Amino acid sequence: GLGTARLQLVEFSAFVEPRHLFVHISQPLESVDVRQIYDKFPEKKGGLRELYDRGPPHAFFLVKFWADLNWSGGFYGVSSQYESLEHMTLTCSSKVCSFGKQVVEKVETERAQLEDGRFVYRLLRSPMCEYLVNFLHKLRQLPERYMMNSVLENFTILQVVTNRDTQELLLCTAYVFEVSTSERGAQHHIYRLVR
Amino acid sequence: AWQARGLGTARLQLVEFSAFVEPPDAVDSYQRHLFVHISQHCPPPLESVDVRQIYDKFPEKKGGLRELYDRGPPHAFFLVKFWADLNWGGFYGVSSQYESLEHMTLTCSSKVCSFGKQVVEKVETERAQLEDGRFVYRLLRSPMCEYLVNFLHKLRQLPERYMMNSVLENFTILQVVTNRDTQELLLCTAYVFEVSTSERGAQHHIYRLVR
Ligand SMILES: *CCC(=O)Nc1cccc(Nc2cccc(OCCCCC)c2)c1
Ligand SMILES: *C(=O)CCCCCCCCCCCCC
Numbered sequence: 529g530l531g532t533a534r535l536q537l538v539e540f541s542a543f544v545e546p547r548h549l550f551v552h553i554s555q556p557l558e559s560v561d562v563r564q565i566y567d568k569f570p571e572k573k574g575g576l577r578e579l580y581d582r583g584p585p586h587a588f589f590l591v592k593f594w595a596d597l598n599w600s601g602g603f604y605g606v607s608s609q610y611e612s613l614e615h616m617t618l619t620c621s622s623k624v625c626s627f628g629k630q631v632v633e634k635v636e637t638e639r640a641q642l643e644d645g646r647f648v649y650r651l652l653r654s655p656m657c658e659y660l661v662n663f664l665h666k667l668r669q670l671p672e673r674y675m676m677n678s679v680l681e682n683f684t685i686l687q688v689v690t691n692r693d694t695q696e697l698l699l700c701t702a703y704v705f706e707v708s709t710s711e712r713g714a715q716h717h718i719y720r721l722v723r
Numbered sequence: 724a725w726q727a728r729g730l731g732t733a734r735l736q737l738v739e740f741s742a743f744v745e746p747p748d749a750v751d752s753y754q755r756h757l758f759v760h761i762s763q764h765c766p767p768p769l770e771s772v773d774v775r776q777i778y779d780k781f782p783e784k785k786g787g788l789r790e791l792y793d794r795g796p797p798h799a800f801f802l803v804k805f806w807a808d809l810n811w812g813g814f815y816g817v818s819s820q821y822e823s824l825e826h827m828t829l830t831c832s833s834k835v836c837s838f839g840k841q842v843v844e845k846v847e848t849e850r851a852q853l854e855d856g857r858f859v860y861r862l863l864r865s866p867m868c869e870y871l872v873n874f875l876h877k878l879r880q881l882p883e884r885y886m887m888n889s890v891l892e893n894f895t896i897l898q899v900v901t902n903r904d905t906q907e908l909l910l911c912t913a914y915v916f917e918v919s920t921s922e923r924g925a926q927h928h929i930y931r932l933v934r
Contacts, residue, residue: 572869600784633868634846655906658786658832659844665784 529555530589530718535618535689535698538648539609542656548599550664552714553591560590562721565702568684570630574623576686579700580723588700588721594708597668597676604656604664610649610689610699615640617692618649624659625684632659637692673707680705726768730761730801730929731821735829735900735909737763738820738859742867744875745814756811758875759925761803772802774932777913780895782834782841791899791911792934800911800932806919809879809887815867821860821900821910826851828903829860835870838893843870848903884918891916 530537530553540553562580569576580588610618617639624632634657640647656664663683670676689699700721708715730737740761746754774792781788792800821829828850835843845868851858874894881887900910911932919926 570869629870630843630868631841632844632846636848637850657844657846658782658784658834659841661785 532587535610535612538611541607544599544602544604546602549714550595551593553716558719559722560719562588562723567628569625569686570628582697587697590702590719590721592717593703593705594715595705596708596714598710600665604661605653606656607653608651612647615647619690619692620651621688623686627682632657676707724768727931728766728768729763732799734823736822737761738822740819742817744811747813757925758807759805759927761927769929769931771933772930774800774934780839781836781897781913782839794908799908802913802930802932804928805914805916806926807916808919808925810921815872817865817867819862823858826858830901830903831862832899834897836895836897843868887918
């Protein structure tokens with residue numbers, strides 16, 4: 529699963545409704561060397577290189593998305609649902625990167641809620657960046673999915689989830705993107721990152 | 724009249740804004756340099772500028788001035804013209820404080836734009852802190868992201884003020900403060916820039932954006 533003893537992703541969708549899901553995770557994982565994807569994110573402070581060093585290594589995951597772009601709007605949303613057995617306040621940083629430069633950093637806070645003898649963190653129907661909405665509307669124009677893939681090889685997201693009070697890193701997920709077909713809806717493959 | 728006297732509405736007032744750098748020496752004898760600074764501690768109607776005149780200086784489609792102005796409310800839109808002081812490996816930071824009569828979760832987006840295209844964007848949320856009968860939203864000492872720090876380091880090495888001014892002619896910043904829960908826009912500030920002259924520190928002029 530995508531998670532640690534301390535925090536687990538329970539669900540993630542980005543979608544549009546005027547529900548079409550561009551990407552959806554509902555909840556022995558393969559390994560990939562983090563060195564392979566250093567040049568996908570900025571090398572300054574808050575870079576994958578210097579984040580993995582600080583540890584803990586077991587908290588770093590890669591998610592590859594085959595996004596469904598078959599659907600001017602519209603409400604454009606992200607929904608995330610995390611859970612834990614300990615009571616925490618989360619800070620969720622999302623850095624949208626184009627050619628390894630950060631073009632958007634979005635910083636959210638979510639306080640734990642008690643539900644069925646576990647703590648849930650609901651960041652539901654958060655409005656998508658104006659930048660992603662515009663990018664999506666242009667991406668959908670492209671005549672060929674090989675062109676959509678060419679444009680996405682340079683487009684990445686890094687989401688760092690911290691224990692607010694302690695600053696302890698809990699989850700670091702790198703996201704990479706291609707496009708799926710219609711008959712073959714959104715798909716993903718979650719990997720663990722190792723050095 | 725109900726025309727703004729400062730940068731704020733009845734729902735949300737800027738208290739203080741500043742971009743600064745603290746030299747490494749700051750730990751020994753404290754000092755900070757203000758690139759720009761707005762203080763509305765203790766206060767005539769503001770002047771008006773037609774938002775159409777600056778459309779092409781900001782991004783387009785979703786979250787471009789024209790669409791933001793279209794969604795409204797029209798009284799929440801301001802233009803700040805900064806004369807930045809560029810005469811100073813330190814700490815580059817941004818501090819903002821807003822006040823409200825009501826309890827809200829604010830979302831704050833800052834969009835750095837070059838020739839009118841979005842380049843770099845920072846989005847933060849701040850929950851209300853209830854103090855002396857009113858709520859305060861404090862976003863103090865946000866690290867300046869590395870694009871603005873590289874930009875400042877380059878701009879300051881230019882041989883001539885007129886060249887700094889020509890570069891800054893195509894450098895703008897759009898700030899949208901929304902009620903995170905309801906999505907209603909509270910405050911939209913467009914920033915245009917020039918250099919000030921070494922002996923004059925940072926200065927600013929605030930305008931109402933009209934149409
Ligand atoms: C570098 C991207 C980023 O994070 N920018 C950022 C972050 C928080 C707040 C702001 N706002 C802002 C608004 C007006 C002026 C500012 O700096 C002035 C320096 C430029 C003078 C030439 C910053 C931006
Ligand atoms: C910006 O508003 C922050 C959003 C951060 C999470 C985005 C998750 C991925 C978006 C899915 C759509 C991309 C398909 C190419």
